[PDB]
């Protein structure tokens, strides 16, 4: 049913970003009529927005009142991917997080509530689906903002029939995640965004991979192209008011991540890994991909090896530009 | 309670119903100073006493200049501001967010630097658990109240802000003024809650608009008990903790109406129906046992006594209450 999006008008809030740019690429592949990207480039690079006849780019916050007022009821689908990137940035400035991570969703939904052409509004939430949450689980304002967007998604559906679908995912990696993308957001994580691109960049430079705690921790990585397809499946076939895990169902240890990256890149430097013991990942739960498979026919099948090969090829091909982007934060990094 | 003697206290939302009662009790307790911060969005200035120990900032707590001007000179902060209430919030979720979610966040973001604070008490909505459903929330107001609990837990864990969440519901008593504040979009601005609506109507000798035979029950709690409960939270509540401040006693709306009529001498009819098992089934009231055990707090004002006090206050102030109600006449007529 991904062809349901053929010849439709789509908005992608946060569409200049990592997941967003990949979603935009896939929408254009599927033959959408128009993509309206709304993105303030707070954590993104304009090089991730194509200069394409189906792509309209509004370089403005989705909280901007004038922008919101200017929106017309001409969208079939909306993908809400904006966030304040990410955990560490949000701890550093909870008010910057609120503006770009909680208020975004509320103001977007308040404008959309009277749009009648809307078939689905897909919200990227953070990471068997249950709708019970703990007040204690939340390590950052980012994590609270993500949860709050689910509260809003449920409310706008119940009260106003906004056809929301919540897509939960975690540990996305792949082409288009640029270290240093966007503005300085307070901490070194602006540069070193996530473990996979940090390790790829370091391995391409022939640097030893800074492996923490022997790399015993595991993550369910998911390739960004699979996430894009999962978000599309939610739009086309997800139940309004509903939620879906968009997940690989496969765990990789950080040590094995490092090893694969080193092997593919030919980075012949040491790795300080340790054997996993029963106490190392004992509490850990990963999201089941079963609901999305059963109800949407969606399966995230790109293997970690194939995904890493693609990501590494893209990173190598763009290494100079990535480095120019990272370097803009040299001063802020030095004084942190 | 006397732990607060001679302390400096801030009451955000201190001009409102619960707030004004809390401020009165704090003064009785002999606090050094109360700083009330209130934009009067749902409140009346006559609920702010002229008293040498009260300072009044007629300003939103989200105002940056006000926040920046605050100094680390408070022993206790009571955060009572909200966007009153469910109905208003549904009408305008953005007005709610500004006065109900953003309030908490910006307040906490300022206070996290303050090391004189012993306790920060947040009035949340109604054994205590910290698990919530994404589905339980009928309104933006409801979401904002829950969000404030999330923030309270976070700021304690991350920044050691000594928060205590106080959960209550169905407060009634002197100082709740029908029509208080600005028009917030719906007739609930006037007809705020069932108790003051019924008291007012009974005093005017009008039939009480009892809905569905009054089979619904509520755990009403008298406002002075809520104020003492908040104080017990401040003095002795565990940082990061939560306590139900509750009566543990249910009254049907039909019995509420009957009592109000009996006290006021309102001789008009009442359409009551008998309560059946399927009428309140599964409705849960908050246990007051944790607050009793840990803080020695119990809410002992009976419904009969509280209603008497409330009716007396209303009768005493009926003229001013009506003048306050009447400012919303045009807005009511067009709703
Ligand atoms: N990458 C992951 O592993 C991961 C995991 C779980 C959930 N998510 C969610 O997926 C979404 C996309 O994340 P990402 O990894 O692509 O990060 P990203 O930072 O690359 O993308 C987010 C985009 O939002 C934009 N933005 C920020 N504030 C805005 C505002 N006020 N108005 C409009 N646009 C704004 C940024 O400039 C950026 O382009 C986010 O909602 C994120 O929380 C991501
Ligand atoms: N009355 C009840 O039965 C009840 C039940 C459960 C929880 N509560 C909570 O108790 C607290 C007090 O409620 P109340 O019944 O006294 O209502 P209220 O409306 O009388 O008091 C709230 C006060 O907050 C003020 N306020 C609004 N926005 C503000 C802002 N931006 N900055 C500063 N002040 C602002 C209002 O002007 C008002 O004086 C609220 O937090 C409410 O959610 C009340
Ligand atoms: O430079 C890095 C960055 C992260 N990680 C590991 O990668 C996992 C996920 O990283 P995140 O920063 O998201 O926490 C954790 O187990 C980290 O210890 C690592 O070994 N080296
Ligand atoms: O004018 C009124 C206002 C409310 N109620 C009842 O009082 C209870 C609580 O009212 P609320 O407005 O809080 O909902 C409910 O069972 C209502 O039906 C009523 O009978 N008449």
Residue numbers in the entry:
A (entry chain A): 6 to 132, 147 to 355
B (entry chain B): 7 to 132, 147 to 355
From the paper:
The wbm locus contains three neighbouring SDR genes (wbmF, wbmG and wbmH), all of which have been annotated as nucleotide-sugar epimerases/dehydratases.
UDP density to the α-phosphate is also visible in the WbmF/NAD/UDP ternary complex. The UMP density in this structure and the chemistry of its interaction with the protein suggests that this protein, like WbmG and WbmH, recognises a UDP-sugar substrate. In both structures the β-phosphate is coordinated by a conserved arginine, although the precise location of this phosphate is different in the two structures and both are inconsistent with the β-phosphate positions of bound substrate in the structure of a D128N, E129Q mutant of dTDP-glucose 4,6-dehydratase, DesIV, from S. venezuelae. In WbmF, this interaction involves Glu231. In the WbmF structure the interface region is extended to include a short antiparallel β sheet composed of the residues Ile151 to Ser153 from each monomer as well as the loops that connect these strands to the bundle (Leu154 to Pro160); 2131 Å2 is buried in the WbmF dimer interface, which is equivalent to 8.6% of the total protein surface. In GMER these residues are Cys109 and His179;21 in GDP-mannose 3,5-epimerase (GME) they are Cys145 and Lys217.12 In WbmG and WbmH these amino acids superimpose onto hydrophobic side chains, but in WbmF this catalytic cysteine is conserved (Cys133) and there are two candidates for the basic side chain, Asn213 and His90. Conversely, if a standard substrate-binding orientation is assumed, the active site of WbmF resembles that of 3,5-epimerases and our structures of this protein identify Cys133 and either Asn213 or His90 as potential mediators of proton exchange in the epimerisation reaction—one group abstracts a proton from the sugar while the other donates a proton to the opposite face.
